[PDB]
mmCIF file of C-alpha atoms in Angstrom:
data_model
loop_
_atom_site.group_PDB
_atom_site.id
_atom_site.type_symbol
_atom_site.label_atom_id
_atom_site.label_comp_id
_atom_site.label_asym_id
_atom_site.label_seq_id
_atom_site.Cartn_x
_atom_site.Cartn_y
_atom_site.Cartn_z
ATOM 1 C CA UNK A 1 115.866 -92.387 -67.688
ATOM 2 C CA UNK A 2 114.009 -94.936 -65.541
ATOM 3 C CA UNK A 3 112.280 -94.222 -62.136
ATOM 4 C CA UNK A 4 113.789 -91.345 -59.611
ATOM 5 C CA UNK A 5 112.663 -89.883 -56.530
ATOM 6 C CA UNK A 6 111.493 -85.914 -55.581
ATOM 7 C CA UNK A 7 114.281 -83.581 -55.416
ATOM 8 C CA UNK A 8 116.342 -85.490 -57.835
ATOM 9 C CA UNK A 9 114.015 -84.774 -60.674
ATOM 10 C CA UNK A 10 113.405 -82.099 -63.118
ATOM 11 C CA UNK A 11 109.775 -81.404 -62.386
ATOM 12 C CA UNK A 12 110.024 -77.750 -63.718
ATOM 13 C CA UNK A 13 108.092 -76.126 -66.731
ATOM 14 C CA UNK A 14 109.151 -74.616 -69.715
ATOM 15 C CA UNK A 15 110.683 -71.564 -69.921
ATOM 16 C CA UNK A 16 109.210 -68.179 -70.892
ATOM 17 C CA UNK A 17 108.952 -65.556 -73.858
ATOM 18 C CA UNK A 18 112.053 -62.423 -73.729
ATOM 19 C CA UNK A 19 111.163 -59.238 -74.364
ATOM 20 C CA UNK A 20 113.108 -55.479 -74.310
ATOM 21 C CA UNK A 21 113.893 -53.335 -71.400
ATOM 22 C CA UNK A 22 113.600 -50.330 -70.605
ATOM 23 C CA UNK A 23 117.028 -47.753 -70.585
ATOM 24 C CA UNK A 24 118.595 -46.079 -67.843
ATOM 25 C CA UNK A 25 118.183 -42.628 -66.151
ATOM 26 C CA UNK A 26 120.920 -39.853 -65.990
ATOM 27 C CA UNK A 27 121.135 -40.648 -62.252
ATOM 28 C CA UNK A 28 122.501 -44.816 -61.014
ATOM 29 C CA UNK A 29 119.285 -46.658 -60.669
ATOM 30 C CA UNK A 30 117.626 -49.787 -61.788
ATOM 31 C CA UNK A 31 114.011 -48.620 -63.773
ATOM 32 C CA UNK A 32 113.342 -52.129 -64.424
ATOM 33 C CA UNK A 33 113.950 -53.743 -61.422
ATOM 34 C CA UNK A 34 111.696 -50.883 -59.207
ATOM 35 C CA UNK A 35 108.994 -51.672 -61.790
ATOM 36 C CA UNK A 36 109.206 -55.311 -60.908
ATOM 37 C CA UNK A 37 109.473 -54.869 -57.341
ATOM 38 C CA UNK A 38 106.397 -52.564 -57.285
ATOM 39 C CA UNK A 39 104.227 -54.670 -59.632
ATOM 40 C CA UNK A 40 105.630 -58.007 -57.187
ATOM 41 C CA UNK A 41 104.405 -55.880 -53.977
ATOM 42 C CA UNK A 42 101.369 -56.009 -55.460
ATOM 43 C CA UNK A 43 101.133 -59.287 -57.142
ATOM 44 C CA UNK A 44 101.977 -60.483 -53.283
ATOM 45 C CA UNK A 45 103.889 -58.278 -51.297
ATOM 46 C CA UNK A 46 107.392 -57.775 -49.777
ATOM 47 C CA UNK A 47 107.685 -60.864 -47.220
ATOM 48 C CA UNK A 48 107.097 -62.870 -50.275
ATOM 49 C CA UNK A 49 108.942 -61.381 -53.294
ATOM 50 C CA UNK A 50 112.251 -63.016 -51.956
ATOM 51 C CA UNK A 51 113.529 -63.499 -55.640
ATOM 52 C CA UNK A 52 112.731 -60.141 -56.533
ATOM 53 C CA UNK A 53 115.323 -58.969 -53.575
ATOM 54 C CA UNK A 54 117.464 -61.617 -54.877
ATOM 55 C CA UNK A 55 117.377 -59.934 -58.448
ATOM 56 C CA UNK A 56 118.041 -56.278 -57.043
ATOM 57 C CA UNK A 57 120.438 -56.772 -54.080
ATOM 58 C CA UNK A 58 122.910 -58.743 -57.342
ATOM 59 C CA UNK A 59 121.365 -55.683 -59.487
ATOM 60 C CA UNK A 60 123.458 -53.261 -57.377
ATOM 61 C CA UNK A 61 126.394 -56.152 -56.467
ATOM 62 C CA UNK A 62 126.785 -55.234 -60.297
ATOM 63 C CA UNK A 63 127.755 -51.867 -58.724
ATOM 64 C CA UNK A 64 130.395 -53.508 -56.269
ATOM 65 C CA UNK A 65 128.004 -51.716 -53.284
ATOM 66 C CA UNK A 66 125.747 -53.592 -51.862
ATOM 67 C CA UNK A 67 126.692 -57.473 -51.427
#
């Protein structure tokens, strides 16, 4: 409600469509997140995926050894 400044301001879109994963593999990995790190590589490479590395670096803080 009435006028506000950048940064203070919800200028986001709406959110997107969920869909299934994949399931794991007899040895500790993350399937899904290597799929979306290779596919973000390519979309624009790893100097510029920093989200991606956000998702799997707390992917394996879930595991207690990385973070």
């Amino acid at each position: 409600g009435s006028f506000t400044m950048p940064g203070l301001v919800d200028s986001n879109p709406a959110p997107p469509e969920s869909q299934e994963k994949k399931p794991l593999k007899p040895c500790c990995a993350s399937p899904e997140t290597k799929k979306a790190r290779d596919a973000c590589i390519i979309e624009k490479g790893e100097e510029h995926c920093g989200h991606l590395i956000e998702a799997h670096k707390e992917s394996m803080r879930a595991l207690g050894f990385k973070i």
